[PDB]
Design a protein around this ligand. Structure first.
Ligand SMILES: Cc1cn([C@H]2C[C@H](O)[C@@H](COP(=O)(O)O)O2)c(=O)[nH]c1=O
Ligand SMILES: Cc1cn([C@H]2C[C@H](O)[C@@H](COP(=O)(O)O)O2)c(=O)[nH]c1=O
Ligand SMILES: [Ca+2]
Ligand SMILES: [Ca+2]
Ligand SMILES: [Ca+2]
Lengths: 204, 206
Protein backbone atom coordinates (compact mmCIF):
# COMPACT_ATOMS: atom_id res chain seq x y z
CA UNK A 1 0.00 0.00 0.00
CA UNK A 2 3.03 2.24 0.61
CA UNK A 3 3.15 6.02 0.99
CA UNK A 4 3.34 8.71 -1.68
CA UNK A 5 5.29 11.75 -0.46
CA UNK A 6 6.06 14.74 -2.68
CA UNK A 7 8.56 17.53 -2.18
CA UNK A 8 7.84 21.02 -3.56
CA UNK A 9 9.23 24.54 -3.44
CA UNK A 10 10.60 27.38 -5.61
CA UNK A 11 13.67 27.12 -7.85
CA UNK A 12 18.65 18.00 -2.44
CA UNK A 13 20.14 16.61 0.76
CA UNK A 14 16.65 16.96 2.24
CA UNK A 15 15.27 14.04 0.28
CA UNK A 16 18.43 11.98 0.87
CA UNK A 17 18.31 12.59 4.62
CA UNK A 18 14.67 11.49 4.79
CA UNK A 19 15.47 8.45 2.66
CA UNK A 20 18.34 7.39 4.94
CA UNK A 21 16.13 7.65 8.04
CA UNK A 22 13.40 5.53 6.49
CA UNK A 23 15.78 2.86 5.17
CA UNK A 24 17.32 2.52 8.60
CA UNK A 25 13.85 1.32 9.60
CA UNK A 26 13.75 -1.37 6.92
CA UNK A 27 11.36 0.66 4.78
CA UNK A 28 11.88 0.54 1.00
CA UNK A 29 12.30 4.00 -0.52
CA UNK A 30 11.83 4.89 -4.17
CA UNK A 31 13.49 8.16 -5.12
CA UNK A 32 12.16 10.00 -8.18
CA UNK A 33 11.38 13.42 -9.73
CA UNK A 34 9.09 15.26 -12.16
CA UNK A 35 9.00 16.03 -14.99
CA UNK A 36 11.04 12.90 -15.70
CA UNK A 37 11.53 9.64 -13.81
CA UNK A 38 11.68 7.29 -16.82
CA UNK A 39 13.65 7.50 -20.08
CA UNK A 40 10.63 8.76 -22.07
CA UNK A 41 9.53 11.08 -19.27
CA UNK A 42 13.05 12.54 -19.21
CA UNK A 43 12.87 13.18 -22.98
CA UNK A 44 9.63 15.05 -22.33
CA UNK A 45 11.34 16.95 -19.53
CA UNK A 46 13.98 18.04 -22.05
CA UNK A 47 11.38 19.55 -24.42
CA UNK A 48 9.71 21.33 -21.52
CA UNK A 49 12.88 22.95 -20.18
CA UNK A 50 14.64 23.88 -23.43
CA UNK A 51 14.42 27.57 -24.38
CA UNK A 52 13.08 28.18 -27.90
CA UNK A 53 12.17 31.14 -30.13
CA UNK A 54 8.78 29.47 -30.73
CA UNK A 55 6.35 30.32 -27.91
CA UNK A 56 4.93 27.21 -26.20
CA UNK A 57 1.17 27.52 -25.73
CA UNK A 58 0.01 27.21 -22.12
CA UNK A 59 -2.15 24.19 -23.04
CA UNK A 60 0.82 22.47 -24.67
CA UNK A 61 2.95 22.94 -21.55
CA UNK A 62 0.15 21.57 -19.36
CA UNK A 63 -0.43 18.57 -21.64
CA UNK A 64 3.29 17.74 -21.87
CA UNK A 65 3.58 17.97 -18.06
CA UNK A 66 0.72 15.53 -17.73
CA UNK A 67 2.04 13.23 -20.46
CA UNK A 68 5.29 12.84 -18.54
CA UNK A 69 3.25 12.31 -15.34
CA UNK A 70 1.19 9.50 -16.89
CA UNK A 71 4.35 7.65 -18.00
CA UNK A 72 6.00 8.19 -14.61
CA UNK A 73 2.92 7.10 -12.63
CA UNK A 74 2.59 3.89 -14.63
CA UNK A 75 6.27 3.03 -14.81
CA UNK A 76 7.61 4.06 -11.40
CA UNK A 77 5.15 5.40 -8.83
CA UNK A 78 2.32 2.86 -8.87
CA UNK A 79 4.65 -0.17 -8.97
CA UNK A 80 6.65 1.23 -6.03
CA UNK A 81 3.50 1.86 -3.98
CA UNK A 82 2.39 -1.71 -4.78
CA UNK A 83 5.63 -3.02 -3.27
CA UNK A 84 4.84 -1.11 -0.08
CA UNK A 85 7.57 1.46 -0.66
CA UNK A 86 7.65 5.06 0.44
CA UNK A 87 7.95 7.16 -2.74
CA UNK A 88 9.88 10.41 -2.31
CA UNK A 89 9.11 12.40 -5.43
CA UNK A 90 10.61 15.81 -6.22
CA UNK A 91 7.66 17.79 -7.60
CA UNK A 92 4.26 16.57 -8.70
CA UNK A 93 0.83 18.03 -9.44
CA UNK A 94 1.13 20.75 -6.78
CA UNK A 95 3.86 22.18 -9.02
CA UNK A 96 1.36 22.12 -11.91
CA UNK A 97 -1.13 24.17 -9.91
CA UNK A 98 1.64 26.59 -8.95
CA UNK A 99 3.53 26.90 -12.26
CA UNK A 100 0.82 26.29 -14.88
CA UNK A 101 -1.94 27.68 -12.66
CA UNK A 102 -0.37 30.49 -10.65
CA UNK A 103 2.37 31.24 -13.15
CA UNK A 104 0.72 30.74 -16.55
CA UNK A 105 -2.78 31.59 -15.39
CA UNK A 106 -4.56 28.41 -16.51
CA UNK A 107 -7.78 27.94 -14.51
CA UNK A 108 -7.69 25.49 -11.59
CA UNK A 109 -10.66 23.60 -13.02
CA UNK A 110 -8.72 22.73 -16.17
CA UNK A 111 -5.70 21.55 -14.22
CA UNK A 112 -8.05 19.51 -12.02
CA UNK A 113 -9.67 17.93 -15.08
CA UNK A 114 -6.28 16.54 -16.19
CA UNK A 115 -5.33 15.60 -12.65
CA UNK A 116 -8.39 13.34 -12.58
CA UNK A 117 -7.93 12.16 -16.15
CA UNK A 118 -4.35 11.08 -15.53
CA UNK A 119 -4.29 10.04 -11.85
CA UNK A 120 -7.78 8.70 -11.26
CA UNK A 121 -8.19 8.81 -7.47
CA UNK A 122 -4.45 8.77 -6.68
CA UNK A 123 -3.02 11.80 -4.82
CA UNK A 124 0.09 12.27 -2.69
CA UNK A 125 -0.42 11.28 0.94
CA UNK A 126 1.86 14.04 2.15
CA UNK A 127 3.50 17.04 0.51
CA UNK A 128 6.50 18.83 1.95
CA UNK A 129 6.75 22.47 0.86
CA UNK A 130 10.21 23.95 1.29
CA UNK A 131 9.37 27.64 1.31
CA UNK A 132 11.79 30.43 0.40
CA UNK A 133 11.46 34.01 -0.83
CA UNK A 134 11.53 33.97 -4.64
CA UNK A 135 14.62 36.16 -5.13
CA UNK A 136 16.86 33.87 -3.05
CA UNK A 137 15.95 30.76 -5.05
CA UNK A 138 16.33 32.47 -8.42
CA UNK A 139 19.72 33.75 -7.33
CA UNK A 140 20.60 30.13 -6.52
CA UNK A 141 19.61 29.18 -10.07
CA UNK A 142 21.36 32.27 -11.47
CA UNK A 143 24.55 31.25 -9.66
CA UNK A 144 24.84 27.97 -11.59
CA UNK A 145 22.26 28.69 -17.86
CA UNK A 146 18.61 29.34 -17.02
CA UNK A 147 15.98 27.09 -18.59
CA UNK A 148 12.50 28.05 -19.87
CA UNK A 149 10.97 28.33 -16.41
CA UNK A 150 13.94 29.74 -14.53
CA UNK A 151 14.03 32.77 -16.85
CA UNK A 152 10.49 33.93 -15.99
CA UNK A 153 9.84 37.21 -14.15
CA UNK A 154 9.10 38.19 -10.54
CA UNK A 155 5.32 38.22 -10.99
CA UNK A 156 5.55 34.64 -12.29
CA UNK A 157 7.55 33.26 -9.36
CA UNK A 158 5.61 35.21 -6.75
CA UNK A 159 2.46 33.55 -8.11
CA UNK A 160 4.27 30.22 -7.84
CA UNK A 161 5.24 30.70 -4.21
CA UNK A 162 1.86 32.02 -3.09
CA UNK A 163 0.00 29.23 -4.89
CA UNK A 164 2.04 26.69 -2.94
CA UNK A 165 1.34 28.45 0.36
CA UNK A 166 -2.39 28.87 -0.30
CA UNK A 167 -2.91 25.22 -1.23
CA UNK A 168 -1.08 24.13 1.93
CA UNK A 169 -3.13 26.47 4.11
CA UNK A 170 -6.35 25.16 2.55
CA UNK A 171 -5.64 21.49 3.28
CA UNK A 172 -3.18 21.50 6.19
CA UNK A 173 -3.73 17.77 6.79
CA UNK A 174 -1.91 17.03 3.51
CA UNK A 175 1.00 19.47 3.74
CA UNK A 176 3.92 20.49 5.91
CA UNK A 177 5.52 23.86 5.18
CA UNK A 178 9.20 24.19 6.04
CA UNK A 179 11.64 27.10 5.98
CA UNK A 180 14.26 26.19 3.38
CA UNK A 181 16.72 28.80 4.68
CA UNK A 182 17.52 27.26 8.07
CA UNK A 183 21.03 26.11 9.07
CA UNK A 184 21.68 22.52 7.92
CA UNK A 185 21.48 21.17 11.46
CA UNK A 186 18.17 22.97 11.96
CA UNK A 187 16.75 21.68 8.69
CA UNK A 188 17.62 18.11 9.64
CA UNK A 189 16.01 18.60 13.05
CA UNK A 190 12.77 19.57 11.32
CA UNK A 191 13.05 16.51 9.09
CA UNK A 192 13.56 14.34 12.19
CA UNK A 193 10.50 15.96 13.74
CA UNK A 194 8.13 15.19 10.86
CA UNK A 195 9.27 11.55 10.66
CA UNK A 196 6.98 10.15 13.39
CA UNK A 197 3.92 11.42 11.53
CA UNK A 198 5.27 10.14 8.22
CA UNK A 199 5.52 6.70 9.81
CA UNK A 200 2.05 7.02 11.32
CA UNK A 201 0.76 7.68 7.81
CA UNK A 202 2.56 4.68 6.35
CA UNK A 203 1.52 2.30 9.12
CA UNK A 204 -2.03 3.67 9.20
CA UNK B 1 -14.14 32.25 -41.80
CA UNK B 2 -11.64 30.05 -43.63
CA UNK B 3 -12.08 26.29 -44.01
CA UNK B 4 -10.56 23.38 -42.06
CA UNK B 5 -10.11 20.21 -44.12
CA UNK B 6 -8.38 17.09 -42.88
CA UNK B 7 -7.04 14.18 -44.87
CA UNK B 8 -7.20 10.77 -43.21
CA UNK B 9 -7.08 7.10 -43.95
CA UNK B 10 -5.49 3.75 -43.07
CA UNK B 11 -1.73 3.56 -42.55
CA UNK B 12 -0.10 4.35 -45.89
CA UNK B 13 1.48 5.71 -47.73
CA UNK B 14 0.90 14.13 -49.10
CA UNK B 15 0.29 13.98 -52.86
CA UNK B 16 -3.45 14.68 -52.69
CA UNK B 17 -3.08 17.39 -50.07
CA UNK B 18 -0.60 19.08 -52.40
CA UNK B 19 -2.90 18.49 -55.39
CA UNK B 20 -6.13 19.90 -53.93
CA UNK B 21 -3.98 22.82 -52.88
CA UNK B 22 -3.23 23.53 -56.56
CA UNK B 23 -6.86 23.52 -57.62
CA UNK B 24 -7.62 25.91 -54.75
CA UNK B 25 -4.64 28.21 -55.35
CA UNK B 26 -5.47 28.69 -59.00
CA UNK B 27 -8.82 30.08 -57.83
CA UNK B 28 -7.08 32.75 -55.76
CA UNK B 29 -7.61 31.02 -52.42
CA UNK B 30 -4.89 31.04 -49.73
CA UNK B 31 -4.01 27.48 -48.72
CA UNK B 32 -2.07 26.45 -45.59
CA UNK B 33 -0.70 22.91 -45.82
CA UNK B 34 0.25 20.99 -42.69
CA UNK B 35 0.27 17.59 -40.92
CA UNK B 36 -0.07 15.90 -37.52
CA UNK B 37 1.57 15.09 -35.31
CA UNK B 38 3.84 18.06 -36.10
CA UNK B 39 3.27 21.33 -37.96
CA UNK B 40 5.50 23.51 -35.76
CA UNK B 41 9.10 23.09 -34.55
CA UNK B 42 7.96 21.89 -31.08
CA UNK B 43 5.15 19.79 -32.53
CA UNK B 44 7.71 18.16 -34.82
CA UNK B 45 9.87 17.34 -31.80
CA UNK B 46 6.86 15.75 -30.17
CA UNK B 47 6.24 13.74 -33.36
CA UNK B 48 9.78 12.40 -33.11
CA UNK B 49 9.17 11.12 -29.56
CA UNK B 50 5.89 9.49 -30.63
CA UNK B 51 7.37 7.74 -33.68
CA UNK B 52 10.69 6.60 -32.21
CA UNK B 53 10.78 2.89 -31.29
CA UNK B 54 11.89 2.18 -27.74
CA UNK B 55 12.31 -0.76 -25.37
CA UNK B 56 10.35 1.25 -22.79
CA UNK B 57 6.61 0.65 -23.19
CA UNK B 58 4.78 3.95 -23.75
CA UNK B 59 1.65 4.10 -21.60
CA UNK B 60 -1.54 4.55 -23.61
CA UNK B 61 -2.33 7.73 -21.67
CA UNK B 62 1.15 9.05 -22.46
CA UNK B 63 0.67 8.42 -26.18
CA UNK B 64 -2.75 10.11 -26.10
CA UNK B 65 -1.49 13.15 -24.21
CA UNK B 66 1.59 13.68 -26.37
CA UNK B 67 -0.66 13.46 -29.43
CA UNK B 68 -2.95 16.15 -27.98
CA UNK B 69 -0.02 18.27 -26.75
CA UNK B 70 1.30 18.47 -30.32
CA UNK B 71 -2.27 19.17 -31.51
CA UNK B 72 -2.63 22.02 -29.01
CA UNK B 73 0.61 23.67 -30.17
CA UNK B 74 -0.32 23.19 -33.83
CA UNK B 75 -3.81 24.64 -33.34
CA UNK B 76 -2.49 27.76 -31.62
CA UNK B 77 0.46 28.32 -33.92
CA UNK B 78 -0.86 27.36 -37.33
CA UNK B 79 -4.45 26.25 -37.69
CA UNK B 80 -6.41 28.95 -35.87
CA UNK B 81 -4.30 31.79 -37.30
CA UNK B 82 -4.83 30.43 -40.84
CA UNK B 83 -8.58 30.08 -40.36
CA UNK B 84 -8.60 33.61 -38.96
CA UNK B 85 -7.18 35.00 -42.19
CA UNK B 86 -9.71 33.01 -44.21
CA UNK B 87 -7.28 30.45 -45.62
CA UNK B 88 -8.16 26.86 -46.41
CA UNK B 89 -6.21 24.62 -44.05
CA UNK B 90 -5.37 21.24 -45.60
CA UNK B 91 -4.08 19.03 -42.78
CA UNK B 92 -2.74 15.47 -43.16
CA UNK B 93 -4.24 13.68 -40.13
CA UNK B 94 -6.04 15.08 -37.11
CA UNK B 95 -8.27 13.85 -34.27
CA UNK B 96 -10.01 11.22 -36.42
CA UNK B 97 -6.62 9.49 -36.48
CA UNK B 98 -6.66 9.61 -32.68
CA UNK B 99 -9.99 7.80 -32.63
CA UNK B 100 -8.69 5.31 -35.22
CA UNK B 101 -5.19 4.61 -33.87
CA UNK B 102 -5.47 5.31 -30.13
CA UNK B 103 -9.09 4.18 -30.00
CA UNK B 104 -9.41 1.41 -32.57
CA UNK B 105 -5.81 0.24 -32.56
CA UNK B 106 -4.79 0.70 -28.91
CA UNK B 107 -8.27 0.15 -27.48
CA UNK B 108 -8.57 3.40 -25.54
CA UNK B 109 -12.20 4.21 -24.77
CA UNK B 110 -13.84 6.63 -27.19
CA UNK B 111 -15.06 8.62 -24.19
CA UNK B 112 -11.54 9.44 -23.02
CA UNK B 113 -10.43 10.56 -26.45
CA UNK B 114 -13.57 12.73 -26.70
CA UNK B 115 -12.79 14.26 -23.32
CA UNK B 116 -9.39 15.42 -24.56
CA UNK B 117 -10.82 16.47 -27.92
CA UNK B 118 -13.15 18.93 -26.16
CA UNK B 119 -10.41 19.97 -23.70
CA UNK B 120 -7.96 20.87 -26.46
CA UNK B 121 -10.25 22.02 -29.28
CA UNK B 122 -13.29 23.39 -27.54
CA UNK B 123 -16.00 23.53 -30.20
CA UNK B 124 -13.63 23.35 -33.18
CA UNK B 125 -13.92 20.42 -35.57
CA UNK B 126 -12.84 20.00 -39.19
CA UNK B 127 -15.38 21.36 -41.67
CA UNK B 128 -14.73 18.43 -43.99
CA UNK B 129 -12.71 15.23 -43.57
CA UNK B 130 -11.57 13.20 -46.56
CA UNK B 131 -11.04 9.53 -45.79
CA UNK B 132 -8.79 7.83 -48.33
CA UNK B 133 -9.91 4.25 -47.87
CA UNK B 134 -7.76 1.35 -49.00
CA UNK B 135 -7.24 -2.33 -48.20
CA UNK B 136 -4.89 -2.47 -45.21
CA UNK B 137 -2.27 -4.57 -47.04
CA UNK B 138 -1.76 -1.97 -49.81
CA UNK B 139 -1.22 0.93 -47.43
CA UNK B 140 1.07 -1.07 -45.14
CA UNK B 141 3.21 -2.03 -48.13
CA UNK B 142 3.48 1.65 -49.10
CA UNK B 143 4.51 2.58 -45.57
CA UNK B 144 6.98 -0.34 -45.49
CA UNK B 145 8.51 0.19 -48.97
CA UNK B 146 11.52 2.04 -47.55
CA UNK B 147 13.16 3.24 -44.33
CA UNK B 148 12.88 1.83 -40.82
CA UNK B 149 9.41 1.04 -39.49
CA UNK B 150 8.49 3.57 -36.81
CA UNK B 151 6.60 2.85 -33.55
CA UNK B 152 3.24 2.62 -35.33
CA UNK B 153 4.39 0.96 -38.56
CA UNK B 154 5.75 -1.88 -36.42
CA UNK B 155 2.24 -2.81 -35.26
CA UNK B 156 0.47 -6.06 -36.15
CA UNK B 157 -2.04 -6.75 -38.94
CA UNK B 158 -5.01 -6.65 -36.57
CA UNK B 159 -4.05 -3.20 -35.31
CA UNK B 160 -4.14 -1.76 -38.83
CA UNK B 161 -7.40 -3.51 -39.71
CA UNK B 162 -8.95 -1.95 -36.59
CA UNK B 163 -7.61 1.44 -37.68
CA UNK B 164 -9.32 1.08 -41.08
CA UNK B 165 -12.66 -0.03 -39.66
CA UNK B 166 -12.80 2.82 -37.13
CA UNK B 167 -12.34 5.42 -39.85
CA UNK B 168 -15.19 3.85 -41.83
CA UNK B 169 -17.52 3.61 -38.83
CA UNK B 170 -16.93 7.24 -37.86
CA UNK B 171 -17.49 8.53 -41.40
CA UNK B 172 -20.70 6.53 -41.72
CA UNK B 173 -22.03 8.17 -38.54
CA UNK B 174 -21.56 11.69 -39.94
CA UNK B 175 -21.89 11.67 -43.77
CA UNK B 176 -22.23 15.48 -43.77
CA UNK B 177 -18.63 16.14 -42.72
CA UNK B 178 -16.91 13.10 -44.27
CA UNK B 179 -16.28 11.92 -47.80
CA UNK B 180 -14.84 8.46 -48.28
CA UNK B 181 -12.65 8.13 -51.37
CA UNK B 182 -11.34 4.90 -52.86
CA UNK B 183 -7.57 5.37 -52.70
CA UNK B 184 -7.23 2.10 -54.62
CA UNK B 185 -8.35 3.56 -57.93
CA UNK B 186 -6.35 4.88 -60.91
CA UNK B 187 -4.96 8.36 -60.19
CA UNK B 188 -7.30 9.74 -62.86
CA UNK B 189 -10.42 8.44 -61.10
CA UNK B 190 -9.20 9.82 -57.77
CA UNK B 191 -7.81 13.13 -59.04
CA UNK B 192 -11.20 13.54 -60.73
CA UNK B 193 -12.86 12.33 -57.55
CA UNK B 194 -11.05 15.27 -55.98
CA UNK B 195 -12.23 17.45 -58.88
CA UNK B 196 -15.86 16.52 -58.28
CA UNK B 197 -15.13 17.57 -54.72
CA UNK B 198 -14.09 21.18 -55.29
CA UNK B 199 -17.57 22.66 -55.81
CA UNK B 200 -18.59 21.38 -52.37
CA UNK B 201 -15.37 22.69 -50.81
CA UNK B 202 -15.66 26.12 -52.46
CA UNK B 203 -19.28 26.37 -51.31
CA UNK B 204 -18.32 25.42 -47.75
CA UNK B 205 -15.76 28.21 -47.92
CA UNK B 206 -18.34 30.82 -48.87
C1 LIG C 1 6.47 18.76 -11.87
C2 LIG C 1 6.39 20.14 -12.51
C3 LIG C 1 7.55 20.87 -12.67
N1 LIG C 1 7.51 22.19 -13.28
C4 LIG C 1 8.77 22.93 -13.46
C5 LIG C 1 9.39 23.51 -12.22
C6 LIG C 1 10.80 23.67 -12.63
O1 LIG C 1 11.01 24.95 -13.09
C7 LIG C 1 11.01 22.69 -13.75
C8 LIG C 1 12.07 21.65 -13.48
O2 LIG C 1 11.91 21.23 -12.18
P1 LIG C 1 13.11 21.30 -11.18
O3 LIG C 1 13.44 22.72 -10.83
O4 LIG C 1 12.85 20.65 -9.86
O5 LIG C 1 14.36 20.70 -11.71
O6 LIG C 1 9.76 22.11 -13.98
C9 LIG C 1 6.25 22.75 -13.73
O7 LIG C 1 6.21 23.86 -14.26
N2 LIG C 1 5.04 22.00 -13.56
C10 LIG C 1 5.09 20.71 -12.97
O8 LIG C 1 4.04 20.07 -12.85
C1 LIG D 1 -2.54 12.64 -36.05
C2 LIG D 1 -2.27 11.25 -35.53
C3 LIG D 1 -1.34 10.43 -36.13
N1 LIG D 1 -1.07 9.08 -35.63
C4 LIG D 1 -0.06 8.25 -36.27
C5 LIG D 1 -0.46 7.54 -37.52
C6 LIG D 1 0.84 7.29 -38.20
O1 LIG D 1 1.27 5.99 -37.94
C7 LIG D 1 1.77 8.29 -37.59
C8 LIG D 1 2.46 9.22 -38.57
O2 LIG D 1 1.56 9.67 -39.52
P1 LIG D 1 1.88 9.44 -41.04
O3 LIG D 1 1.90 8.01 -41.43
O4 LIG D 1 0.86 10.08 -41.90
O5 LIG D 1 3.25 9.97 -41.39
O6 LIG D 1 1.02 9.02 -36.67
C9 LIG D 1 -1.77 8.58 -34.46
O7 LIG D 1 -1.54 7.45 -34.03
N2 LIG D 1 -2.74 9.42 -33.83
C10 LIG D 1 -3.00 10.73 -34.32
O8 LIG D 1 -3.83 11.43 -33.75
CA1 LIG E 1 14.85 24.56 -11.81
CA1 LIG F 1 8.54 4.23 -44.96
CA1 LIG G 1 3.51 6.16 -41.47
Amino acid sequence: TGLFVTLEGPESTNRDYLAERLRERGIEVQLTREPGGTPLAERIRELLLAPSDEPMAADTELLLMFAARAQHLAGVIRPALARGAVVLCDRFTDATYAYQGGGRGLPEARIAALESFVQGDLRPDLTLVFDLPVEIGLARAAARRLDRFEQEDRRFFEAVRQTYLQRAAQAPERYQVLDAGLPLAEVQAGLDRLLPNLLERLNG
